[PDB]
Amino acid sequence: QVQLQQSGTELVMPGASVKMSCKASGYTFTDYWMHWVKQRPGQGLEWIGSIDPSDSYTSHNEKFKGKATLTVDESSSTAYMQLSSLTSEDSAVYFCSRSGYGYYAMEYWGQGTSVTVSSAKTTPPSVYPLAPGGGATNSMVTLGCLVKGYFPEPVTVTWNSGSLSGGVHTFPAVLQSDLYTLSSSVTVPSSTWPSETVTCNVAHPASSTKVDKKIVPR
Amino acid sequence: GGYMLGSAMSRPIIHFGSDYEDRYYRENMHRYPNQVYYRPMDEYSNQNNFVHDCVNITIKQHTVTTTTKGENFTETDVKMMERVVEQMCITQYERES
Amino acid sequence: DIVLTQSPAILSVSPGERVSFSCRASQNIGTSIHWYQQRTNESPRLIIKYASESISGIPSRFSGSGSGTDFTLSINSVESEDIADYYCQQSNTWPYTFGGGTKLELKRADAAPTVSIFPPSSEQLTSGGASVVCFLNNFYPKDINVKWKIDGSERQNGVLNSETDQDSKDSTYSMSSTLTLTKDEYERHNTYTCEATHKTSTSPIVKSFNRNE
Ligand code: NA
């Protein structure tokens, strides 16, 4: 069975280079072109360039010519793409893919290396409780947790040690002053709050951070 | 002298990455060399050097014999010969070491 | 460059229905077009190659037709797992190009947004920060615009937005909008209003709060 192995993630400083690997198995390496495809968050696919591992002949999207250097290591059945002089424009997922034999549909795809370009340091998140003040809805109440200024991704957000898993919306993270911010809402019965405890537990593995924030009225 | 002509080599399939070029290659490859000209082995600093010269001289000699015979090599032709003559020069530099 | 145009950019469909979308090339490419499916947070997957050739392990309900400049992918009976983006791509000549994608979605009932507004925590006010949060949860269709107003005048600066994907269970959408200001700036005003405009009603839902109470 053909496999294409890519690292999950890379954190790279602006201006630095990164070399992404794509390791193939389950077939004859030199018999098929390998291809690299960029996808910016929430956007479409863009072709970068492709290489024939047999002789390392390449083809590039004109605009990546000088920016993306494609190589293989025949001894390890590995294709590499190096991006240099990174900017925030280079933050994206990079897939490798392999075509057929003398045919050029992309038959096998790697899982993608998610690249984040940032000068931010590992920074633990701040967790602020969002409780309301004033006019209640009908038999229902909404709580939230604001997670501000952390790096890198991800955080794990749970509610009540995972026992609240019913009416939760955790929004995708956004960039705020060179750092990430997200929020999570939870909607619960008014019989349960503030009559009992609601706590959001926010884990930031990269900083070994684990903070519980109990939500209190006012 | 100063060049030498190597023995003839079997033609590789070469895939050029797009449906049009693969077809183009398959139809035009009979027009390209199946053997290379080169300078002796003790006259280059390395492989890269030998190969560069072997490719240029060969396409030049090949281009000259075809034109007397009329017709021309286009830019795709020129592009594809370099790739394939390059492969061939490399096998040849290997036969020497 | 061969430009590939896909339409529509988003398509809403009901399960079991037969659907189609098209890919058109600016130059003739014979049959050199391929289709890929990409579900949220996954790699793309080859679904049809060369306009019409089926692919091992892809459900037979997928088919493609066409040759030249005008290509179509059809799905005989849409299943939830087929909700995804679909891109076409050509390999006739360099550069490879991709269509911009057609997003598949599930048809559901129009649903107005649920709006909850939350003031800054004391902790945060303590660190000199003030973020006002607005959640707009479980609405359909996805299109929605959020405008913030302060003491009646619309603010545009210091507003960051985030959207969830369509819910797998109830097929709805949710949105988060957070306006961050300085504590000083925050103390310079009293009333904060989040205002959501959606198709479900011509009247914007206004949620707001006054510091003075
Ligand atoms: Na199924």
Buried b (16+ CB within 10 A) or exposed e, C73-91: bebeebeeebbbbbbbbbb
**Residues C86, C87, C91, C95, Cα dihedral to 10°:** -160
A80 near A9, Cβ under 8 Å?
Answer: no
Of the candidates C95, C88, C103, C77, which has an alpha carbon nearest to the alpha carbon of residue C33? C88
Of the candidates B40, B36, B44, B18, which has an alpha carbon nearest to the alpha carbon of residue B91? B36
Question: CA-to-CA distance for B24 and B14, rounded, in angstroms?
Answer: 11
A31 near A55, Cβ under 8 Å?
Answer: no
Q: Is C124 helix (H, G, I), strand (E, B) or coil?
A: helix
Q: H or E stretch including A48?
A: strand A45-52
Q: Which residue pairs from A60-64 have beta carbons closer than 8 angstroms and sit at least 24 positions apart in sequence?
A: A60/C95, A61/C95, A61/C96, A62/C95
Q: What is the DSSP letter of A15?
A: T
The CA distances from residue C90 to B14, C25, C203, in Å, are 20, 9, 46
For B12, the token pair is 């590789």
For B47, the token pair is 């492989």
Q: How many CA atoms lie within 13 Å of A160's alpha carbon, on the beta-carbon side? A: 15
Question: CA-to-CA distance for A6 and C46, rounded, in angstroms?
Answer: 18
A106 near A98, Cβ under 8 Å?
Answer: yes
Question: CA-to-CA distance for A37 and A20, rounded, in angstroms?
Answer: 12
C106 near C14, Cβ under 8 Å?
Answer: yes
Q: What is the largest distance, in Å, between two alpha-carbon atoms of chain C?
A: 70
Topology, domain C109-211: Immunoglobulin-like (2.60.40)
Best residue in A35, A36, A52 for a mutation probing chain B (most B CBs within 10 Å) = A52
CB contact under 8 A, A109 and C43: yes
Of the candidates A34, A110, A40, which has an alpha carbon nearest to the alpha carbon of residue A72? A34
Q: What is the DSSP letter of C52?
A: T
Neighbours of A101 (CB within 10 A): 12
Q: Is B66 helix (H, G, I), strand (E, B) or coil?
A: helix
C139 near C172, Cβ under 8 Å?
Answer: yes
Question: CA-to-CA distance for A77 and A27, rounded, in angstroms?
Answer: 9
Q: H or E stretch including C78?
A: none
CA C79 to ligand 1 centroid distance, Å: 7
Q: What is the 3-state secondary structure (H, E, C) of A174-199?
A: EEECCEEEEEEEEEEECCCCCCCCCE
The CA distances from residue C153 to B57, C147, C157, C203, in Å, are 75, 10, 12, 18
Question: CA-to-CA distance for A114 and B15, rounded, in angstroms?
Answer: 30
Of chain C, the end-to-end C-alpha distance in Å amounts to: 62
Domain CATH for B14: 1.10.790.10
Of the candidates A165, A160, A171, which has an alpha carbon nearest to the alpha carbon of residue A215? A160
For B34, the token pair is 């199946």
Question: CA-to-CA distance for A148 and A128, rounded, in angstroms?
Answer: 8
Strand A168-170 and strand A174-176: the pairing is unpaired
For A212, the token pair is 């519980």
Question: Residue B65: exposed, middle, or buried by beta-carbon count in 10 A (0-12, 13-18, 19+)?
Answer: exposed
- The CATH architecture that domain A1-119 belongs to is Sandwich (2.60)
Of the candidates A104, A49, A102, which has an alpha carbon nearest to the alpha carbon of residue A79? A49
Same fold, A1-119 and A120-218: yes
C204 near C195, Cβ under 8 Å?
Answer: yes
Total structural domains in chain B?
Answer: 1
CB contact under 8 A, B19 and C94: no
A147 near A126, Cβ under 8 Å?
Answer: yes
Concatenating the DSSP letter of every residue in A90-151 gives: G-EEEEEEEE-SS--SEEEE---EEEEE--PPPBPPEEEEE---S---SSEEEEEEEEEEEB
For B51, the token pair is 């190969």
Question: CA-to-CA distance for B19 and A14, rounded, in angstroms?
Answer: 38
Cα-only R_g, chain C: 23
Q: Locate the chain C residue with the closest alpha carbon to A94.
A: C43
CB contact under 8 A, C162 and A129: no
Question: CA-to-CA distance for A218 and A133, rounded, in angstroms?
Answer: 5
Range list for CATH 2.60.40.10 in chain C? 1-108, 109-211
For C134, the token pair is 């607005």
Question: CA-to-CA distance for B47 and B35, rounded, in angstroms?
Answer: 18
Question: CA-to-CA distance for C157 and A43, rounded, in angstroms?
Answer: 24
Which residues in chain A have their CB less than 8 angstroms from residue C85's CB? 44
Q: How many CA atoms lie within 13 Å of B18's alpha carbon, on the beta-carbon side? A: 20
Question: CA-to-CA distance for A51 and A57, rounded, in angstroms?
Answer: 6
CB contact under 8 A, C92 and B21: no
Question: Residue C114: exposed, middle, or buried by beta-carbon count in 10 A (0-12, 13-18, 19+)?
Answer: buried
Quick check: bond before A129 cis, omega within 30?
Answer: no
Cα-only R_g, chain B: 14
A98 near A35, Cβ under 8 Å?
Answer: yes
**Location of structure tokens 């839902």:** C205
Paired strand residues for A211? A202
Strand A9-12 and strand C159-163: the pairing is unpaired
C180 near C129, Cβ under 8 Å?
Answer: yes
Quick check: bond before B2 cis, omega within 30?
Answer: yes
Q: What is the largest distance, in Å, between two alpha-carbon atoms of chain A?
A: 71
Best residue in A97, A130, A216 for a mutation probing chain C (most C CBs within 10 Å) = A130
CB contact set of A162 (below 8 Å; sequence gap of 6+): none
Q: Which CATH number fits domain C1-108: 3.40.50.150, 1.10.10.10, 2.40.30.60, 2.60.40.10?
A: 2.60.40.10
What is the resolution in angstroms?
2.4
Chains with 3 or more CB pairs under 8 A to chain C: A, B
CB-based contact, A55 to chain B, within 8 Å: yes
* B–C CB contacts, 8 A cutoff, strictly below: 14
| Length reported for chain B | 97
Of the candidates A56, A39, A37, which has an alpha carbon nearest to the alpha carbon of residue A47? A37
Question: CA-to-CA distance for C64 and B72, rounded, in angstroms?
Answer: 41
CB contact under 8 A, A110 and C43: yes
CA C77 to ligand 1 centroid distance, Å: 10
The CA distances from residue A122 to A51, A201, A207, C180, C198, in Å, are 36, 19, 6, 22, 39
Buried b (16+ CB within 10 A) or exposed e, A195-214: eeebbbbbbbebbebeeebe
Q: Where are the domains of chain A?
A: 1-119, 120-218
Question: CA-to-CA distance for A166 and A8, rounded, in angstroms?
Answer: 29
Q: With left for phi above 0 and alpha for psi between -120 and 50, is residue B60 left, alpha or beta?
A: alpha
- Kindly report the nearest CA distance between residue B76 and chain C, in angstroms: 12
* Class of the CATH-defined domain A120-218: mainly beta
Of the candidates B53, B46, B37, B54, which has an alpha carbon nearest to the alpha carbon of residue B97? B46
Question: CA-to-CA distance for C78 and B71, rounded, in angstroms?
Answer: 56
Quick check: bond before A194 cis, omega within 30?
Answer: yes
CA C81 to ligand 1 centroid distance, Å: 7
* Strand boundaries in chain C, DSSP class E: 4-7, 10-13, 19-25, 33-38, 45-49, 53-54, 62-66, 70-75, 85-90, 97-98, 102-106, 114-118, 129-139, 144-150, 153-155, 159-163, 173-182, 191-198, 205-210
CB contact under 8 A, C92 and B18: yes
For B65, the token pair is 């014999």
Question: CA-to-CA distance for A33 and A49, rounded, in angstroms?
Answer: 10
Question: CA-to-CA distance for B96 and B7, rounded, in angstroms?
Answer: 12
Question: Residue A167: exposed, middle, or buried by beta-carbon count in 10 A (0-12, 13-18, 19+)?
Answer: middle
Q: Which residue pairs from A59-68 have beta carbons closer than 8 angstroms and sit at least 24 positions apart in sequence?
A: A59/B17, A59/B18, A59/C94, A59/C95, A60/C95, A61/C95, A61/C96, A62/C95, A68/A36
Amino acid identity, position B10: S
CB contact under 8 A, B13 and A102: yes
Amino acid identity, position A103: Y
**Residues A168, A174, A180, A182, Cα dihedral to 10°:** -20
Paired strand residues for C194? C148, C207
Residue B51 belongs to domain spanning: 1-97
